Structures are given as structure tokens and as C-alpha cells.
């Protein structure tokens, strides 16, 4: 994967561009909001080697947090603004893409 530096720390990986999963939120309305806005959300995740964690939840938390930090930084310079709903939705889709990444790392091991 590509090596990356985020927030002045290296050792991150940037995954491939992924097919973002459709997420369900428990209302048709929010589902359709997601479909209409998902292009604004990440489709690539930042992660660290599996060996830097003792458990999956910590791997995935870092991947969610840093991805959304980096995305928010780079997109705010191009004029983006995210609402509370956007942030919640990004946390869910990025969490699924980070779990997929964890599975890929765990099968490689």
C-alpha cells in the first residue's frame, strides 16, 4: 500500500480506493441522504500495521479517526463543510472500510 505521514507521524498506510458500501441507518430518509452525499465521504482509509495493536477495535478506531481527520483537513481547504449527520455517516462508512482493511491484514498474516 502507499506509505503516508499524517499529523507529523509516519508509518501509516493509505489503502486503495474502494467501492464504498451502502450503509443502512434505520430510516429511509437517512438512507437516501447517505446515497446522495456518500461521494463527499472518504473512499480510502489510513491505517497502521496490525502488529502495532493487540486487538481489532484499536486498529479500526485509529483508522476511522485519522482518516476522517485527514479528510476533514484536506476537504475544508477546498470549501467543504460537514454537518453532524455527515460526521456520523462518515464514521459508519469509514468504520466498515477499516474493518475490511483489518480483514485483509489479518488474512495476509
Amino acid at each position: 500500500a502507499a506509505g503516508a505521514v499524517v499529523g507529523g507521524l509516519g508509518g501509516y498506510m493509505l489503502g486503495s480506493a474502494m467501492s464504498r458500501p451502502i450503509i443502512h441507518f434505520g430510516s429511509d430518509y437517512e438512507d437516501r441522504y447517505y446515497r446522495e452525499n456518500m461521494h463527499r465521504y472518504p473512499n480510502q482509509v489510513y491505517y497502521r500495521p496490525m502488529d502495532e495493536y493487540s486487538n481489532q477495535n484499536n486498529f479500526v478506531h485509529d483508522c476511522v479517526n485519522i482518516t476522517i481527520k485527514q479528510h476533514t483537513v484536506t476537504t475544508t481547504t477546498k470549501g467543504e463543510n460537514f454537518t453532524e449527520t455527515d460526521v456520523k455517516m462518515m464514521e459508519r462508512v469509514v468504520e466498515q472500510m477499516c474493518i475490511t482493511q483489518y480483514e485483509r491484514e489479518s488474512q495476509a498474516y
Partner: nanobody
Amino acid sequence: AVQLQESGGGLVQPGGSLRLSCAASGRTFSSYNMGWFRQAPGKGREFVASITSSGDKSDYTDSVKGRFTISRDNAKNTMYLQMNNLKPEDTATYYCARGLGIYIIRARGGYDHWGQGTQVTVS
């Protein structure tokens, strides 16, 4: 070279309480995020909790959330870990560390300046 020293370890009964301290030498304590990790024999060094430079945000591994509390005294070059409701699975050497970069993370690669550790044994 900033150095960090853990203290406060010991033998504690299940359900009991201990407070660890991390003291830093130097004059840049408040400029850096900080964290606590733990290592038991047969396991690697794993995330426990972290706190930003200012104290504005903290983070915990899931197994300690609600039981342990990280804090820092920026005027005294000291970080603390209050550990409540201790369990046998919490037995480990506890290490404090200084954050790398501007973001607190859970990865072992996100910190350096490791102390020599303090041993916590929960009967």
C-alpha cells in the same frame, strides 16, 4: 533528553484501586500528547489510555473504559492513571510514553520516550 519515570505500581486486590504517576524531566511537558501502555508476560505492549497536550481530549482501550481515568498536571510535569475496579486481566508492567505527531492514537508506533515501567499485580 526528556526522560519519563513511572511510579505507583504494586500488589492490589481484585476490585481495588491504584493511582499511577508519570513524571517527566525537561521543560516541554505541556507541548506533547502523552499515553499509557501495558505489557504482561507473553503479550506485547498494548494501548491503555492517552491524553492531549492541553488535556482537552482523552482516549481509552475498550477494556478499561469506565474504570480508568487519565489526567495530567501541566504545572507539575506529571501525568496520572487512576485505576479503579482492578481485575486480574489488568496485571502488567505499565509504561508511560510521549506522543509522536499531533494526534493521539492507539498504535504502539504513536509514542516514544518509554519509561522503565511500573509493575501492577492484581492478586
